[model samples]
Target chain A: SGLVPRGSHMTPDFLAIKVGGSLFSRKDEPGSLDDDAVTRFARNFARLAETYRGRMVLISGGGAFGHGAIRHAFSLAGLTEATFEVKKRWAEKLRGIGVDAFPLQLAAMCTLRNGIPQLRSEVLRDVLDHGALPVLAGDALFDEHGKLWAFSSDRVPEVLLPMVEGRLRVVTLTDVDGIVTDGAGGDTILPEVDARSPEQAYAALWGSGAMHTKLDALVTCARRGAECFIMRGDPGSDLEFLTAPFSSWPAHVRSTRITT
Target chain B: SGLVPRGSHMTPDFLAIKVGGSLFSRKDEPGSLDDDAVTRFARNFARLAETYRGRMVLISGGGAFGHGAIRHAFSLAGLTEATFEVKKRWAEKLRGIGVDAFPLQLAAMCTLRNGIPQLRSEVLRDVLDHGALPVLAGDALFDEHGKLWAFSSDRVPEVLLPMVEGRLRVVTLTDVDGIVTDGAGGDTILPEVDARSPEQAYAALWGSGAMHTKLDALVTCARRGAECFIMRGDPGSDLEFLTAPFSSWPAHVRSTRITT
Candidate 1:
C-alpha cells in the first residue's frame, strides 16, 4: 500500500523512470515496449541503480494501452450504467507486469481528500511499514463537485515535490537519442538546461509530446528546487547513463534541469 | 498461440480452473480478489501446485469486481467505441497474471470471423507454431451495424470437441458439488453416462441458468464419443473428490461422468 520503513539504506532522493504506453503497444507496425524494449529498460534501470542507487519511483504515460481519456467519461455516467470496462482491464494488465497501480479515481480521491499532505502521509506510512514503492497512474475519477476528471498521472512527481526531502529529478528515457531539433547531422543528445525556458524547450520538443508536460512539471519542480531531465531510454542500451548525474549526458539527458 | 515450440515442461495434463469477470473487481470485500484473496489464492495455488509438482493455470472470471456487462453495453450504444486498444488491454491483464487469457472478442477476432472462423486461421497458426492455451471467456461483440451481441463462451469445449483425439474428457467444474437437483444430495454426480440423450439431458435441468447450457454442451460432446464429467468443484475440500484423478490422492471426487 505504501513504502517500507526508513533505515540506513533509505536514500531520500527519488529516481523517476518514465515509461509511455506506446512502448508496450503493438498496433502500429511495431510498438516501443516490446520484448526488446522491456528487457533493455529493465537492464538499464538495474544499471542506473549501480551508480545513483536510491529509492526509485516510476512515472509513465498510459501509452496506447492505458485506454486514453474515454474511460474517465464513462465514470460520469455511473459505473453501473457505463458500457466498457476500460480501467478495470488496464489495472489488471499493469499489475500483472510487477506494477503497483493506483486506479485513477482511487488515487485522485486519495490525493484530493488528503491533498499532497495525504500523499506525504501515505509515503511515510508505506515507507514506515514496508519497503514498498508508491505508484500512481492516471484514471477516471469523480471530481470535487462529483464531476469527471482525468487524473494526469504524469504529475505524480509533483505530488511528491512537497513531500520529498531532497531534490526531485524527472528523468524521461525516450526513444530519441537526446533532445535535439535544428541540425541535420547532430550529436547523440541535444542539450541540458538549468532554467525553465519554454522557447528553448519548445525547440527541442519537435517530435516529443511530453515536452509541455515535462516543462510544466519541471517548472513546478524548479519552484521547489527540483531538476528534471529528458533523455533517451529506449529499450536498447545498458542504462549506465541512468547511474551518472545530469551533467554527464549531453543533449536530451539534461534537456531541462531547473533549480528552485 | 499454442504452447511453446520446444514443448516446455509446462505440460502436466488437464487442469481444472474457473474463469470469471467478477474476480477482477476492486471491491473491498473478502470474496473479491482484494489483498487477502489475491494473497491467499496465490499462496494456496502455488502451494497446491508445488504439492502436486505441477504448474497451475488460474482461469479467473472478469467483471467479478466491477460492473462489466453494463460497460460492454456502453460500447454498443455509441456511448464509446471499442478499439484494438481495449482488446489489447484485456488480453494484457490476462497475460499479466501469467495466465493465458483469451478475452472473448479478442479470441473471436483472432480465431473467428462472422462466427465463421475469421481469426481462427491465424490463432490456429500461432497455436501450431507455438503451443498456446487459449483462455476462454464470454464477451460482447460489435456486429455489422455496430450492434452488440452476447457471445456465450460455454460452448467452447464443444467447438473444440473435434480436436480431442485421445480419451477426450470434458470436465465441467462448477460451484456446486455435482449436478444436484432441488434438495437432492446423494448420488447427484452421475458416475458415468452411456448415451448423451438430448431428450433425457433436457429433462435433468437443475435450477435456473448455466447447468442446462453446460449439459447441452456435454450432450454434444457425448454424442461425438467424447467423455464428459460434470462435478462439484466447490472451494472447500469438495474438490478433493474430483482432484483424485488428476492427483495421486486417493480421495473421492464429486463428479458425474457423462459418456456415450
Candidate 2:
C-alpha cells in the first residue's frame, strides 16, 4: 500500500484518526479552550502512541482555537488574508505545546480545503518518518488568486485516505455517540452506516450539517474501500477501540462503522 | 544590489534588520522574558513596518528562549533533534501572537549559520510578495547528515545580504551601543569600524565572543560591498535610524557603522 512501507512498523491496518475540536474547546464558549480536556486528550493520545506509534496519523479539529480566530478575523476583514493570518496563529500555538503543526506551503496547497491528495499523502509519510504523529486541523487557507477558504477538518481524511498506500481505516473521534437519530436529545446510536446510501444517512442525520459532512466523508472513504468508524472520545474508549482488532471491535466502543 | 527590486514601495536602499534577543528577554534572568520589553519592541517594529512596509526582513537572536530550551534539551539528549524542536517551539510562541514565522526547512539549510545565500535571498523576495515582515531567529538546524548545529541569528544577514536582488544594508539592533572598548562596562561606543579588517575588529571586540561573531558577519557584509550598522533597540533609536536614509542617519543614534 502507498502509506505503509512493507518492513516498517506501520502496516496495512494502521489507522488515520481525527480528534474533533469539541474535545478541546467549550461548546458554550466559542473562543475558550478547556485545558483539562486538552490534557486528558493528550494523555490518552500518548497512550495510543505507545501502542500504535508510527502507524497512526492524528488530525485534530481547530474547535475554538480555529473557529474563534476565524470569526474574529472575519469580523475584522470579511474573510480576507487576515483570516488566514489568524488561522496560522492558532496552528502555531498548538504546535508550540506539542502538536505537529502543518507547513505553510502544505497549508497553502489545501486552501480550498480539499484535493491535493498526493501532497497530503507525502506529508503524512514524512510525519511518520520524522517520528512524529501527523496532527492536522481545519484551517484558513489562501489560493493562487488570494482567495480564502476554511477547509473543514473532517474532509481531510476523505482526500488523503485514498491516495495513501495502505489498506487504511479512519476513526473520527467526536463529542457524541455516532449518529443520533432525533437530534441532540437522541440517546440511541446508529450501529452501522452504509456509505453507499447517502439518502438514508442524511435522513438519519436529520439537520446536523457538521455530522452530515463527516458522514459524507466516511461515505467517500467506503467507496474507496476504506472503513470509517465514528465514536466518542470519552476517557478510555479510544484505547479500547484503537487496540482491538476491527472485526472484534465492540459495539459499545464504536457508535457507527461505515464500510463498503 | 541584489536585495531590492526595480519598482515597489521597497527600493535599493531597503534594509534587513536583526534584533538581538536581549532586548526582549531579561539579560540577568536567562529563562525569563519581559513581556513589556517584547511589547515595546513589537510596537516599534510595527512602526518600522509602517514606513519600510514589505521591504524589511527582521531576524531576532534566540536569547533566553532559545538558549534555555537548548540547554534543557541538550542535557536531555545531548544536542540532537531536541534542540531544533526547542528552537521551533520558541518560534511558534512568537508567531502565535502576530509574528510571521519562518520555516524550519529554511533555517535548516543554513545550519552552520552561514552559507545559504540563494535560498535565503529567494525567501526574502517571497516575503515581499507575501506581504509578511520576514521575522527569523537564531535556531537549531540539521545539516545534510542530520548533524545538529546552533545557527546564530547574527550570521543570517551575512549569508543573505549579498544574495538579495538589490542594493542592501544591515541594521543590528541590540541592547548595547555597537562594539564598546571595555566589555559591558564600556562607556564609549565606536562610531565606525572598517569591515575590511577583521584583525582590528577582534581587537576592538576584546574578549567578548558574541561581539566577535557579530563583527565577523559584518566583515563579510563589507567584503560583499554592503554596509552594516549597529545600534540599540531602546525607544526612539529604531524610529530615528529606520526612517532616515542611511547617508543621513545620525552618527549618535548608531553606535557603529561597519563600512567597506
Candidate 3:
C-alpha cells in the first residue's frame, strides 16, 4: 500500500506566481508584518490553489521582513534573523491550510553573479514531483563569492522559468490595480503593453520602486513567451483570472497584460 | 549589526560525520525513534560541535524511521511522514543548543542513479559559510526518473568530499566498537582495514546491514586520503577522537582508524 509514485517529472500546465512584498506590509512600517494580509492570502490561496498542487511555484517579496534593496550597507547581506522568522510564519500558515509549502531557502543553494541567481532548477522540479509546492522569497544570497548579492521575487521567476515545460504562465499580484502609466490621455493602467516595443518606454517614465519591480519582473517572463498578468491584491477583486485564459479575463477587474 | 559578513565560502579544516540511525532507534521497532538516544547525541554533539561551527556536516541514517532499503515495494519511498517528523525532532534539539541546523531536504535536491546520490555540493559549502551547519537524512529521494533509488547517510560524505579543501576528516558513530573481522585466528575488531586490499574481503563475509553500511561509508573516504574513524556509540566514551590527530587517539578507547 506504500508504493512510491513514479514519474512526477513533467506537467503540461504549470504556473509561476510572485506575490508582492507590499501586499504583506508597507515599507514605512519597517519589519511589521500585516497579519490580516497574510491570513487573507493564505486562506484564499489555499482555497484556490488546491487544484494547482504539484504544478505551481510560489515566491514572496521581502515586505516588512526585509527588502532586496534598502539603500543601506545591509542590503542582501545574507540570511538575517528576519528571513528566518518570516519563513517559519509563512510556512506554518500555509501548512495549516492543507498546503505543503517548502521554504526553499535560496542562500544555501543560490549562486549570484551580477545580482542574478544561478539556481539548481532540478531541485525545483523535484519539489513538484513530490506534490509539495516550492515556496521561496526574494533572498539576500551568500554564495561562493564576496559580492553583495540579493534580488526581489521579481527576478526569481525569471531564474526558474527555464525548467518549466509546456503552457507556462506567470502572474504578479501587488497593491496597485496594475502597471500605472502615462497613457495616451492622462495616467492609467496600461492594459496591453508589449515588452519588446515602445510601449515598454511608456511604463518606464513613471517606473521606480513598485512599478520598477513590476516592469523588471513581468517583462522578462513575457520575453520568454509565457503569458504575464499584473493585478491588484486588494480584497475587492476576482481570482477568475488566475485559472482562466488571458483573453477571457474579466474586463471589469482592472488589470494589465504584458505581451512579448 | 545587520551588515552581511563577507567570505563565508572557505574554511581550512572541515569535518563531516554520519550519525547512525540505529543510535536513535533499532530496526526491530519499525518506525519508533528513541528519544533518549537523540537527546544524548544532540546534547553531546552541540556540546562538542560548538567549537566546529561553520565546519561540519551532520547526517542521520534511517534506523527506525525508514531504511534506504527495506524488503518491500516501499523501499526508497519519497518523503514519508516518518522522515518529516524525525527531521523536526533532531533539528529542534540541535537548534535548542545554539546550532543552526539547516535541514537540507535532500528529496528536493538529490539525484539517485544506481542507488548513489549526485548532490549539489555548493549548498553544503554555503551552509558552512553562513555559520549554520547542514543537516540531512538518508532519504527516499524523488528524482526526475523512474529508478527506485535511495541510500543511507553512509554515502553522503563520500558524495560531499570533493567540495572540501585543505584538511578533511570523516567520522562514523555507530553502535559497534569498530569494524570487526575474521583476523589471523578468530573474529576480532580489526585494528585497521585497508580499502584497497584483501583485508577488505575479510570484513565482507561478516557484513550485512550495519557492518555493511559502515564499510560502504568509510572505505571511499580513505581512498580520498581523508582519515576515517569507526567507533562505538555507548555512553562509555571519549570525544577526543573527534578533534584530535589520529596518532594521538586515546589508546584505551578501542577505535578503528581507516586511512589511505
DockQ of each: 0.02, 0.10, 0.12
What would the DockQ be for model 3?
A: 0.12
Tens-place lDDT digits, model 3, residues B56-84:
77777767766523443223343333354
| Docking quality tier of model 1 | incorrect
Instruction: Please provide, for model 1 over A1-260, each residue's C-alpha lDDT reduced to its tens digit, 9 standing for 90 to 100.
Output: 34434322233266666655455445343213355555455455544433443255555555543443233222321221111233333333333444332222223122243223123122222321232232334443333333334444455566666556654556665555545665545443445554545566566565434556656665666666565666555666555544455545434334434443
Higher-DockQ candidate of 1 and 3: 3
By summed lDDT, which 10 consecutive residues of candidate 3 chain A come out lowest?
A3-12
True lDDT of residue A164, candidate 3? 66
| Interface RMSD over true interface Cα atoms for each candidate | 19.9, 9.0, 6.4
lDDT of each: 0.42, 0.56, 0.63
Question: For model 2, what is the error of residue A181's alpha carbon versus the real structure, in angstroms, after optimal superposition?
Answer: 3.8
Query: DockQ of candidate 1?
Result: 0.02
How many clashes in each structure?
55, 13, 0
TM-scores, chain A, per candidate: 0.64, 0.75, 0.82
Candidate 3 local lDDT, A16-130, one digit each (tens): 7777777787777777777777777777666445767778877777777665234422233423334534554565667766676656655545667665567753666666776
Per-residue C-alpha lDDT of model 2 across residues A181-242, encoded as one tens digit per residue: 66567557777776777576678667347787798888888778676778888633446456
